[PDB]
Design an enzyme around this catalytic site. Structure first.
Site, PDB file in Angstrom:
ATOM      1  N   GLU A   1       0.843  -1.187   0.000  1.00  8.33           N
ATOM      2  CA  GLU A   1       0.000   0.000   0.000  1.00  8.33           C
ATOM      3  C   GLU A   1       0.878   1.237   0.000  1.00  8.33           C
ATOM      4  O   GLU A   1       1.919   1.285   0.648  1.00  8.33           O
ATOM      5  CB  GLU A   1      -0.937  -0.007   1.215  1.00  8.33           C
ATOM      6  CG  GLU A   1      -1.845  -1.244   1.260  1.00  8.33           C
ATOM      7  CD  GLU A   1      -3.101  -1.015   2.084  1.00  8.33           C
ATOM      8  OE1 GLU A   1      -3.061  -1.173   3.327  1.00  8.33           O
ATOM      9  OE2 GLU A   1      -4.139  -0.668   1.476  1.00  8.33           O
ATOM     10  N   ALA A   2       0.460   2.228  -0.753  1.00  4.03           N
ATOM     11  CA  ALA A   2       1.278   3.411  -1.030  1.00  4.03           C
ATOM     12  C   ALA A   2       1.734   4.168   0.202  1.00  4.03           C
ATOM     13  O   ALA A   2       2.903   4.586   0.267  1.00  4.03           O
ATOM     14  CB  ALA A   2       0.462   4.347  -1.953  1.00  4.03           C
TER      15      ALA A   2
END
Length: 353
Positions: free
Chosen positions: A105-106
Site C-alpha cells: 500500500e502506497a
C-alpha cells in the site's frame, strides 16, 4: 522460569504468527500477551527480523504504519540495526529490502522509504555532495524501487521495460528544477541490471514454488499459508474392495489450513509437475485410521461439520505405517490449529462492541 515447549505451547505460537500474517497488530498483541516476545519496541524489532513464519509483506505493513506510536518506535529500532555507511543509495536499499519487502500500500511504502532515507542520511554525513533539495533522496529511493520492480517484473514485457535513457529521462529536473547527476543514475541502473534487489525468502516463497508446479491449485500463496508436509498416498475409492498396490497415486500437499490432493502430470529427469484434483478445508475435518484385509494403512477423512450429518471426503492407503502416523499426526494438529483460529476469529463479536 520459562514455559516449556509442549505441543499446545507450540500451537499457540503458530496461532500468533497466523494472526500476524492476517492482521499484524493483532498478531503482535497476541504474541506479547502470551510471553513469546517482550512488550518493547526493541523486542518486537528483533522478533520481526529474526523469526521464521512471518510474511515479509505483513512485516512491511506493520512497520509502514505511521498511525501508531508503537509501530513507529519498532521501525526506528529496525533501521538503527542497519549500517548504510559509505555505500551508494541502491546498495543501502539492497540491504534494507533484504529484510523488508518495500512493496504494498502506497502510504506504507512511503513510510518505509522515509525511515530508510533518514537512516541513510545519518549514516552518510561524510558525503559532501548533496542535492539542492534534501528531499530529493526520497525521490531517488522511490525511483530505484520502481526500476527494480519494472526490470524484473514478469508482467512487463521486455520491449516495454525501462531502458537506461528511459530511467534517466523520467527523473529530469527533479532536484529543484535540475537533474540528478547522470553518472549517478547510470551507476544505479547498471548495479540493478546486474543483480535484482531480492527480499529474503519466507514461508510464502515456499508455497509460491509449489503453486507454479501445479496446473489447475495454482493460487495458494496467501500471506498466512504455510506448507506443512508433502506426502505420497494412494487413493482408495472403495475401502471394501481390493486394488493394486501402486494404483491411484497421489501427491498430497498439507498446508496449515488446507489439504491439497494432486497427481503427477509430467516427470522428467528430475523436475515434476502436478495436476490439481481437489482441496479440502480443515475446519470440521476428522481423521480416521482403518485397516482391513485389503488395506493395512488406511486413512479416511470426514467432514463432521453441521448443516447435514457426517460426510466422507476421501480415503487413502499409505505405503507404510510410519507414513500414515506422521501424516495423520500433522493433519490432526493442523485441524486443531484451525479450530482455535476459528474460535479467535469469532472475536468479531468484540468488534460489534
Amino acid at each position: 522460569p520459562a514455559f516449556s515447549n509442549d505441543v499446545i505451547r507450540k500451537r499457540h505460537y503458530r496461532i500468533g504468527l497466523n494472526l500476524f500474517n492476517k492482521k499484524p497488530e493483532k498478531g503482535v498483541q497476541y504474541l506479547i500477551e502470551r510471553g513469546f516476545v517482550p512488550d518493547t519496541p526493541v523486542g518486537v524489532a528483533h522478533f520481526l527480523l529474526q523469526r521464521k513464519g512471518l510474511s515479509r509483506q505483513m512485516i512491511g505493513e506493520f512497520l509502514g504504519n505511521r498511525q501508531k506510536q508503537f509501530n513507529r518506535d519498532v521501525l526506528d529500532c529496525v533501521v538503527d540495526e542497519m549500517d548504510f555507511s559509505t555505500m551508494e543509495l541502491d546498495e543501502a536499499l539492497r540491504k534494507f529490502q533484504a529484510h523488508i519487502r518495500v512493496q504494498g500500500e502506497a502510504q506504507k511504502v512511503e513510510r518505509l522509504i522515509e525511515a530508510f532515507s533518514q537512516r541513510y542520511c545519518i549514516c552518510n554525513p561524510g558525503v559532501v555532495r548533496q542535492f539542492r533539495n534534501p528531499d530529493t533522496i526520497f525521490i531517488l529511493a522511490f525511483a530505484i524501487i520502481l526500476l527494480n520492480t519494472d526490470m524484473y517484473s514478469p508482467n512487463v514485457k521486455p520491449e516495454r521495460k525501462m531502458k537506461l535513457e528511459d530511467f534517466i529521462k523520467n527523473l529530469r529536473g527533479v532536484d529543484d528544477g535540475e537533474d540528478i547527476p547522470r553518472e549517478m543514475l547510470m551507476g544505479i541502473y547498471e548495479r540493478i541490471r546486474k543483480r535484482e534487489l531480492k527480499t529474503n525468502e519466507d514461508h510464502v516463497s515456499q508455497v509460491q514454488k509449489v503453486e507454479k508446479l501445479i496446473v489447475g491449485g495454482c493460487v495458494l500463496s496467501l500471506p498466512h499459508r504455510r506448507l506443512v508436509c508433502y506426502c505420497r498416498l494412494f487413493e482408495v475409492p472403495d475401502p471394501n474392495k481390493p486394488q493394486k498396490l501402486g494404483l491411484h497415486q497421489r501427491e498430497i500437499f498439507l498446508f496449515n489450513d488446507l489439504l491439497v490432493v494432486t497427481k503427477i502430470f509430467q516427470k522428467k529427469k528430475n523436475s515434476v509437475t502436478y495436476s490439481f484434483r481437489q482441496s479440502f478445508s480443515l475446519y470440521g475435518m476428522q481423521v480416521l485410521l482403518f485397516e482391513n484385509q485389503y488395506y493395512p494403512n488406511g486413512i479416511r477423512l470426514t467432514s463432521s461439520v453441521p448443516g447435514a450429518d457426517i460426510k466422507v471426503l476421501i480415503n487413502f492407503n499409505a505405503p507404510n505405517p510410519q507414513d500414515r502416523k506422521k501424516f495423520t499426526d500433522d493433519l490432526r494438529e493442523s485441524i486443531a490449529e484451525v479450530q482455535e483460529m476459528e474460535k479467535h476469529r469469532i472475536e468479531s463479536e468484540l468488534e460489534k462492541q
